[PDB]
Amino acid sequence: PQLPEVETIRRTLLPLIVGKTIEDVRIFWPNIIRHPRDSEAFAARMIGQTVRGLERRGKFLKFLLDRDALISHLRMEGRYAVASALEPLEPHTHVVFCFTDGSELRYRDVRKFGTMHVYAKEEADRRPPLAELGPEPLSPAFSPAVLAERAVKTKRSVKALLLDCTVVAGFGNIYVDESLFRAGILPGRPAASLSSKEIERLHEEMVATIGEAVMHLYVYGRQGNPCKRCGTPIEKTVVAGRGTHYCPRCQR
DNA sequence: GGTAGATCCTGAC
DNA sequence: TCAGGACTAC
Ligand SMILES: [Zn+2]
């Protein structure tokens, strides 16, 4: 899931778990647990805590309990569901939080790429994976000025810059390619080669593209098909190690 | 320090 | 054979 989907999860999951008290935590793929490194310590500390809130930072979910916060990233295919402890688990369920009311919060992930970190609330923001996280793309903290500062200071491509979590929080591949197309900028351009006008325009399209989503694709996954704006075949290459889609006519 | 590289894991080739 | 987000060593 991408940022907009993660926000939808935050909104819809919260009422389904708020005020419930953890009675058990069951872990079927320990690699997912990143802190405490010992999955048994992870499970033990959460027991007896009540869910008080659920926040999002970038593509991370932050479950707020009594003492601790649980920081969760779903990566490509992770998913949460709330269901009865009386029913069989779905395939690829790797972590389960059991509540005193007989319901469960279940984490599934076919690829097993997702991560979980637990810390005392007051420490969560200054430890990985939240430490160093850039500003929310939809917040005043993410400004053309901030983007300009990072752009001028690097030798990397503009695509690499946008993919960097320290630059802006949770801006995914699909939105990078769509934003660059909408801003008329080739993904392979050196970030420092962008004019102030290009930076401004890119910031604007980033906010609009992801803003629209949180509430129709031009290039992403459209290789070999005609550009919706000029009819030129969309091309796909690799930029910053990622599948990268662009129109060689609309983007410069 | 900035930056590439390595890394996980398995469905779809 | 390999893409895909967010500690190590060049
Ligand atoms: Zn075009």
mmCIF file of C-alpha atoms (C1' of nucleotides) and ligand atoms in Angstrom:
data_model
loop_
_atom_site.group_PDB
_atom_site.id
_atom_site.type_symbol
_atom_site.label_atom_id
_atom_site.label_comp_id
_atom_site.label_asym_id
_atom_site.label_seq_id
_atom_site.Cartn_x
_atom_site.Cartn_y
_atom_site.Cartn_z
ATOM 1 C CA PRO A 1 0.000 0.000 0.000
ATOM 2 C CA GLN A 2 1.070 3.583 -0.690
ATOM 3 C CA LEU A 3 0.649 6.637 1.550
ATOM 4 C CA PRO A 4 -2.982 7.341 0.634
ATOM 5 C CA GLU A 5 -3.935 3.712 1.285
ATOM 6 C CA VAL A 6 -2.061 3.773 4.601
ATOM 7 C CA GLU A 7 -4.054 6.843 5.617
ATOM 8 C CA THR A 8 -7.273 4.999 4.766
ATOM 9 C CA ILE A 9 -6.104 2.109 6.950
ATOM 10 C CA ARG A 10 -5.337 4.467 9.851
ATOM 11 C CA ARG A 11 -8.803 6.036 9.656
ATOM 12 C CA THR A 12 -10.770 2.809 9.288
ATOM 13 C CA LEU A 13 -8.769 0.605 11.674
ATOM 14 C CA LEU A 14 -8.793 2.976 14.667
ATOM 15 C CA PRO A 15 -12.465 2.627 15.678
ATOM 16 C CA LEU A 16 -12.136 -1.157 15.312
ATOM 17 C CA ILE A 17 -9.373 -1.367 17.929
ATOM 18 C CA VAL A 18 -9.514 1.734 20.154
ATOM 19 C CA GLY A 19 -10.131 0.984 23.832
ATOM 20 C CA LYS A 20 -9.356 -2.711 23.423
ATOM 21 C CA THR A 21 -6.834 -4.333 25.758
ATOM 22 C CA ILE A 22 -4.166 -6.714 24.484
ATOM 23 C CA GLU A 23 -4.290 -10.122 26.120
ATOM 24 C CA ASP A 24 -1.846 -11.948 23.791
ATOM 25 C CA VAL A 25 0.565 -11.373 20.891
ATOM 26 C CA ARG A 26 1.306 -14.254 18.510
ATOM 27 C CA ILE A 27 4.157 -14.210 16.030
ATOM 28 C CA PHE A 28 4.564 -16.656 13.137
ATOM 29 C CA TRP A 29 7.375 -14.907 11.232
ATOM 30 C CA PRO A 30 9.760 -13.316 13.771
ATOM 31 C CA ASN A 31 11.844 -11.560 11.099
ATOM 32 C CA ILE A 32 9.048 -8.994 10.909
ATOM 33 C CA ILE A 33 9.783 -7.910 14.495
ATOM 34 C CA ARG A 34 12.656 -5.409 14.417
ATOM 35 C CA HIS A 35 12.556 -4.005 17.983
ATOM 36 C CA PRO A 36 12.861 -5.358 20.560
ATOM 37 C CA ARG A 37 14.958 -7.699 18.406
ATOM 38 C CA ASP A 38 13.704 -10.599 20.520
ATOM 39 C CA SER A 39 10.136 -11.279 19.361
ATOM 40 C CA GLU A 40 9.354 -12.716 22.803
ATOM 41 C CA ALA A 41 10.121 -9.351 24.439
ATOM 42 C CA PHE A 42 7.991 -7.618 21.782
ATOM 43 C CA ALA A 43 5.017 -9.835 22.638
ATOM 44 C CA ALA A 44 5.468 -9.705 26.432
ATOM 45 C CA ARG A 45 5.586 -5.913 26.748
ATOM 46 C CA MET A 46 2.407 -5.275 24.788
ATOM 47 C CA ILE A 47 0.233 -7.558 26.915
ATOM 48 C CA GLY A 48 -2.052 -5.642 29.261
ATOM 49 C CA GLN A 49 -1.832 -2.417 27.289
ATOM 50 C CA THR A 50 -4.916 -0.765 25.843
ATOM 51 C CA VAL A 51 -5.005 0.761 22.365
ATOM 52 C CA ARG A 52 -5.452 4.503 22.785
ATOM 53 C CA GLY A 53 -4.780 5.832 19.297
ATOM 54 C CA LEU A 54 -3.501 5.313 15.762
ATOM 55 C CA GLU A 55 -1.425 7.816 13.824
ATOM 56 C CA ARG A 56 0.387 7.825 10.491
ATOM 57 C CA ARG A 57 3.830 9.107 9.592
ATOM 58 C CA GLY A 58 4.701 8.695 5.931
ATOM 59 C CA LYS A 59 3.773 5.095 5.145
ATOM 60 C CA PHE A 60 4.306 4.068 8.803
ATOM 61 C CA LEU A 61 1.410 3.369 11.146
ATOM 62 C CA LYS A 62 1.936 4.302 14.800
ATOM 63 C CA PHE A 63 -0.312 2.415 17.206
ATOM 64 C CA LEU A 64 -0.448 4.282 20.533
ATOM 65 C CA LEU A 65 -0.919 2.128 23.626
ATOM 66 C CA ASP A 66 -0.699 2.954 27.340
ATOM 67 C CA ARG A 67 3.069 3.066 27.672
ATOM 68 C CA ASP A 68 4.332 1.981 24.253
ATOM 69 C CA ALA A 69 3.953 2.818 20.585
ATOM 70 C CA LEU A 70 3.940 0.139 17.874
ATOM 71 C CA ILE A 71 5.451 1.357 14.583
ATOM 72 C CA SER A 72 4.364 -0.668 11.562
ATOM 73 C CA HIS A 73 5.301 -0.594 7.847
ATOM 74 C CA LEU A 74 3.372 -2.781 5.397
ATOM 75 C CA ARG A 75 5.798 -2.460 2.468
ATOM 76 C CA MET A 76 4.339 -3.834 -0.797
ATOM 77 C CA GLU A 77 1.621 -6.226 0.327
ATOM 78 C CA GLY A 78 1.112 -6.025 4.103
ATOM 79 C CA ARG A 79 -2.461 -5.770 5.380
ATOM 80 C CA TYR A 80 -4.345 -5.508 8.695
ATOM 81 C CA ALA A 81 -7.757 -6.950 9.527
ATOM 82 C CA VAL A 82 -9.836 -7.194 12.701
ATOM 83 C CA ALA A 83 -11.701 -10.463 13.194
ATOM 84 C CA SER A 84 -12.885 -13.064 15.679
ATOM 85 C CA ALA A 85 -10.423 -15.313 17.491
ATOM 86 C CA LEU A 86 -12.925 -18.090 16.746
ATOM 87 C CA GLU A 87 -12.330 -18.102 12.972
ATOM 88 C CA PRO A 88 -9.405 -19.680 11.073
ATOM 89 C CA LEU A 89 -6.662 -17.236 10.090
ATOM 90 C CA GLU A 90 -6.275 -16.285 6.432
ATOM 91 C CA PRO A 91 -3.155 -17.411 4.518
ATOM 92 C CA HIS A 92 0.110 -15.513 5.102
ATOM 93 C CA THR A 93 -0.867 -14.225 8.569
ATOM 94 C CA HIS A 94 2.391 -13.466 10.373
ATOM 95 C CA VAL A 95 1.446 -11.464 13.502
ATOM 96 C CA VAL A 96 -1.738 -11.481 15.603
ATOM 97 C CA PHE A 97 -2.727 -9.192 18.474
ATOM 98 C CA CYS A 98 -5.388 -10.801 20.661
ATOM 99 C CA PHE A 99 -7.764 -8.520 22.603
ATOM 100 C CA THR A 100 -9.633 -9.300 25.854
ATOM 101 C CA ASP A 101 -12.958 -9.107 24.010
ATOM 102 C CA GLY A 102 -12.174 -12.115 21.824
ATOM 103 C CA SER A 103 -11.344 -10.070 18.731
ATOM 104 C CA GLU A 104 -7.956 -9.912 16.998
ATOM 105 C CA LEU A 105 -5.850 -7.502 14.975
ATOM 106 C CA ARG A 106 -4.170 -9.621 12.258
ATOM 107 C CA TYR A 107 -1.190 -8.766 10.087
ATOM 108 C CA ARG A 108 -0.873 -10.557 6.731
ATOM 109 C CA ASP A 109 1.932 -10.166 4.200
ATOM 110 C CA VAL A 110 2.572 -12.594 1.327
ATOM 111 C CA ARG A 111 6.052 -11.175 0.720
ATOM 112 C CA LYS A 112 6.967 -10.869 4.419
ATOM 113 C CA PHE A 113 8.667 -7.509 3.793
ATOM 114 C CA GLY A 114 6.763 -5.570 6.471
ATOM 115 C CA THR A 115 8.336 -4.391 9.745
ATOM 116 C CA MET A 116 7.327 -3.776 13.380
ATOM 117 C CA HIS A 117 9.150 -1.758 16.073
ATOM 118 C CA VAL A 118 7.924 -1.157 19.658
ATOM 119 C CA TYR A 119 9.265 1.569 21.986
ATOM 120 C CA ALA A 120 8.081 3.642 24.927
ATOM 121 C CA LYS A 121 5.909 6.367 23.354
ATOM 122 C CA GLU A 122 8.276 9.188 24.242
ATOM 123 C CA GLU A 123 11.136 7.474 22.398
ATOM 124 C CA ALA A 124 9.406 6.310 19.212
ATOM 125 C CA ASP A 125 9.994 9.526 17.262
ATOM 126 C CA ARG A 126 13.748 9.531 17.963
ATOM 127 C CA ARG A 127 14.441 5.881 17.120
ATOM 128 C CA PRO A 128 14.293 3.949 13.859
ATOM 129 C CA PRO A 129 12.380 3.752 11.679
ATOM 130 C CA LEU A 130 10.793 7.159 12.385
ATOM 131 C CA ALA A 131 14.015 8.984 13.220
ATOM 132 C CA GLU A 132 15.160 11.154 10.301
ATOM 133 C CA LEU A 133 11.785 10.815 8.567
ATOM 134 C CA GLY A 134 11.171 13.852 6.381
ATOM 135 C CA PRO A 135 8.092 16.111 6.567
ATOM 136 C CA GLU A 136 4.631 14.957 5.499
ATOM 137 C CA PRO A 137 4.174 15.738 1.798
ATOM 138 C CA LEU A 138 0.838 17.418 2.619
ATOM 139 C CA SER A 139 2.192 19.579 5.451
ATOM 140 C CA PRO A 140 3.581 23.143 5.431
ATOM 141 C CA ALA A 141 6.827 21.525 6.595
ATOM 142 C CA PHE A 142 7.253 20.168 3.070
ATOM 143 C CA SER A 143 7.846 23.300 1.014
ATOM 144 C CA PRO A 144 9.394 24.123 -2.358
ATOM 145 C CA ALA A 145 12.145 25.734 -0.281
ATOM 146 C CA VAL A 146 12.867 22.477 1.547
ATOM 147 C CA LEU A 147 12.881 20.583 -1.746
ATOM 148 C CA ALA A 148 15.163 23.156 -3.367
ATOM 149 C CA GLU A 149 17.641 22.842 -0.486
ATOM 150 C CA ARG A 150 17.918 19.072 -0.866
ATOM 151 C CA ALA A 151 17.998 19.217 -4.668
ATOM 152 C CA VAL A 152 20.953 21.604 -4.894
ATOM 153 C CA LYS A 153 22.974 19.587 -2.374
ATOM 154 C CA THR A 154 23.041 16.239 -4.191
ATOM 155 C CA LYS A 155 24.478 14.599 -7.309
ATOM 156 C CA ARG A 156 21.612 12.109 -7.609
ATOM 157 C CA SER A 157 18.694 12.035 -10.043
ATOM 158 C CA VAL A 158 15.491 13.887 -9.183
ATOM 159 C CA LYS A 159 13.740 10.511 -8.973
ATOM 160 C CA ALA A 160 16.267 9.301 -6.386
ATOM 161 C CA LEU A 161 15.670 12.490 -4.407
ATOM 162 C CA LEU A 162 11.890 12.067 -4.234
ATOM 163 C CA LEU A 163 12.250 8.406 -3.242
ATOM 164 C CA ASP A 164 14.409 9.425 -0.265
ATOM 165 C CA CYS A 165 12.405 9.161 2.968
ATOM 166 C CA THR A 166 14.552 11.846 4.648
ATOM 167 C CA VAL A 167 13.512 14.325 1.957
ATOM 168 C CA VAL A 168 9.771 13.725 2.148
ATOM 169 C CA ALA A 169 7.814 11.095 4.076
ATOM 170 C CA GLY A 170 6.495 8.062 2.221
ATOM 171 C CA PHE A 171 6.309 9.328 -1.366
ATOM 172 C CA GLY A 172 6.096 6.114 -3.378
ATOM 173 C CA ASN A 173 7.323 5.060 -6.827
ATOM 174 C CA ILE A 174 3.933 5.405 -8.499
ATOM 175 C CA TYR A 175 3.556 8.988 -7.254
ATOM 176 C CA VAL A 176 7.136 9.905 -8.120
ATOM 177 C CA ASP A 177 6.638 8.864 -11.765
ATOM 178 C CA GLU A 178 3.182 10.454 -11.950
ATOM 179 C CA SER A 179 4.385 13.674 -10.312
ATOM 180 C CA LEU A 180 7.397 13.945 -12.624
ATOM 181 C CA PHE A 181 5.233 13.396 -15.683
ATOM 182 C CA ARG A 182 2.749 16.004 -14.482
ATOM 183 C CA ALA A 183 5.621 18.420 -13.847
ATOM 184 C CA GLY A 184 7.213 17.669 -17.239
ATOM 185 C CA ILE A 185 10.543 16.513 -15.795
ATOM 186 C CA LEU A 186 12.527 13.422 -16.848
ATOM 187 C CA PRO A 187 13.146 11.062 -13.894
ATOM 188 C CA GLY A 188 16.819 10.733 -14.830
ATOM 189 C CA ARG A 189 17.533 14.462 -14.621
ATOM 190 C CA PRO A 190 20.146 15.349 -12.017
ATOM 191 C CA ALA A 191 18.240 16.853 -9.083
ATOM 192 C CA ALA A 192 20.639 19.798 -9.030
ATOM 193 C CA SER A 193 19.860 20.470 -12.699
ATOM 194 C CA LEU A 194 16.301 21.516 -11.843
ATOM 195 C CA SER A 195 15.540 25.228 -12.049
ATOM 196 C CA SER A 196 13.661 27.026 -9.279
ATOM 197 C CA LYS A 197 10.635 26.982 -11.571
ATOM 198 C CA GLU A 198 10.972 23.220 -12.029
ATOM 199 C CA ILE A 199 11.313 22.722 -8.270
ATOM 200 C CA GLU A 200 8.227 24.837 -7.612
ATOM 201 C CA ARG A 201 6.236 23.007 -10.279
ATOM 202 C CA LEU A 202 7.363 19.601 -9.013
ATOM 203 C CA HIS A 203 6.408 20.421 -5.418
ATOM 204 C CA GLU A 204 3.018 21.557 -6.687
ATOM 205 C CA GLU A 205 2.409 18.339 -8.643
ATOM 206 C CA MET A 206 3.636 16.181 -5.761
ATOM 207 C CA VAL A 207 1.144 17.768 -3.370
ATOM 208 C CA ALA A 208 -1.648 17.615 -5.954
ATOM 209 C CA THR A 209 -0.981 14.035 -7.017
ATOM 210 C CA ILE A 210 -0.794 12.544 -3.528
ATOM 211 C CA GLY A 211 -3.406 14.970 -2.184
ATOM 212 C CA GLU A 212 -5.897 13.828 -4.814
ATOM 213 C CA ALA A 213 -5.132 10.200 -3.983
ATOM 214 C CA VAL A 214 -5.641 10.585 -0.226
ATOM 215 C CA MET A 215 -9.118 11.810 -1.177
ATOM 216 C CA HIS A 216 -6.301 7.611 -13.732
ATOM 217 C CA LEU A 217 -2.583 7.149 -14.404
ATOM 218 C CA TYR A 218 -0.457 8.922 -17.017
ATOM 219 C CA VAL A 219 2.704 6.822 -17.118
ATOM 220 C CA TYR A 220 2.954 4.298 -14.306
ATOM 221 C CA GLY A 221 2.606 0.794 -15.744
ATOM 222 C CA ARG A 222 1.699 2.244 -19.131
ATOM 223 C CA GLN A 223 4.859 1.373 -21.084
ATOM 224 C CA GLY A 224 4.232 0.670 -24.764
ATOM 225 C CA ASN A 225 0.921 2.515 -24.597
ATOM 226 C CA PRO A 226 0.314 6.022 -25.973
ATOM 227 C CA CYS A 227 0.787 9.003 -23.695
ATOM 228 C CA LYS A 228 -2.614 10.407 -22.738
ATOM 229 C CA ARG A 229 -1.339 13.915 -23.466
ATOM 230 C CA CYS A 230 0.722 13.500 -26.668
ATOM 231 C CA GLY A 231 0.227 9.937 -27.935
ATOM 232 C CA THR A 232 3.941 9.126 -27.786
ATOM 233 C CA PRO A 233 4.573 5.586 -26.532
ATOM 234 C CA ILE A 234 5.338 5.603 -22.820
ATOM 235 C CA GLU A 235 8.748 4.141 -22.099
ATOM 236 C CA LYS A 236 10.072 2.163 -19.155
ATOM 237 C CA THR A 237 13.647 2.067 -17.911
ATOM 238 C CA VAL A 238 15.455 1.702 -14.601
ATOM 239 C CA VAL A 239 16.259 4.830 -12.601
ATOM 240 C CA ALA A 240 17.643 4.689 -9.064
ATOM 241 C CA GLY A 241 17.158 0.922 -9.224
ATOM 242 C CA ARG A 242 13.390 1.251 -9.715
ATOM 243 C CA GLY A 243 11.051 0.614 -12.628
ATOM 244 C CA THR A 244 10.616 4.060 -14.120
ATOM 245 C CA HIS A 245 7.922 5.217 -16.530
ATOM 246 C CA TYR A 246 7.942 8.414 -18.531
ATOM 247 C CA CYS A 247 6.898 10.097 -21.737
ATOM 248 C CA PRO A 248 10.013 11.059 -23.692
ATOM 249 C CA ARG A 249 8.089 13.909 -25.333
ATOM 250 C CA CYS A 250 6.212 15.492 -22.408
ATOM 251 C CA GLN A 251 9.145 15.193 -19.995
ATOM 252 C CA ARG A 252 12.480 16.985 -20.446
ATOM 253 C "C1'" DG B 1 29.424 12.320 5.403
ATOM 254 C "C1'" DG B 2 27.218 11.415 0.792
ATOM 255 C "C1'" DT B 3 26.303 7.582 -1.958
ATOM 256 C "C1'" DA B 4 25.876 3.054 -4.027
ATOM 257 C "C1'" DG B 5 25.146 -1.637 -2.682
ATOM 258 C "C1'" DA B 6 23.278 -5.268 -0.276
ATOM 259 C "C1'" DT B 7 19.099 -7.027 1.617
ATOM 260 C "C1'" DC B 8 14.642 -9.544 2.362
ATOM 261 C "C1'" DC B 9 10.950 -13.109 -0.084
ATOM 262 C "C1'" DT B 10 8.106 -15.144 -3.407
ATOM 263 C "C1'" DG B 11 4.642 -14.519 -7.349
ATOM 264 C "C1'" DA B 12 4.867 -13.972 -11.876
ATOM 265 C "C1'" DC B 13 8.290 -14.694 -15.959
ATOM 266 C "C1'" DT C 1 15.612 -14.176 -13.251
ATOM 267 C "C1'" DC C 2 14.076 -10.415 -10.391
ATOM 268 C "C1'" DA C 3 11.313 -6.043 -8.390
ATOM 269 C "C1'" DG C 4 10.340 -3.968 -4.307
ATOM 270 C "C1'" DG C 5 11.177 0.399 0.928
ATOM 271 C "C1'" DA C 6 13.748 1.784 4.142
ATOM 272 C "C1'" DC C 7 22.215 -1.064 7.660
ATOM 273 C "C1'" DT C 8 26.881 -1.437 5.713
ATOM 274 C "C1'" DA C 9 30.700 -0.033 3.529
ATOM 275 C "C1'" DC C 10 32.670 2.383 -0.845
HETATM 276 ZN ZN ZN D 1 3.519 12.706 -23.714
#
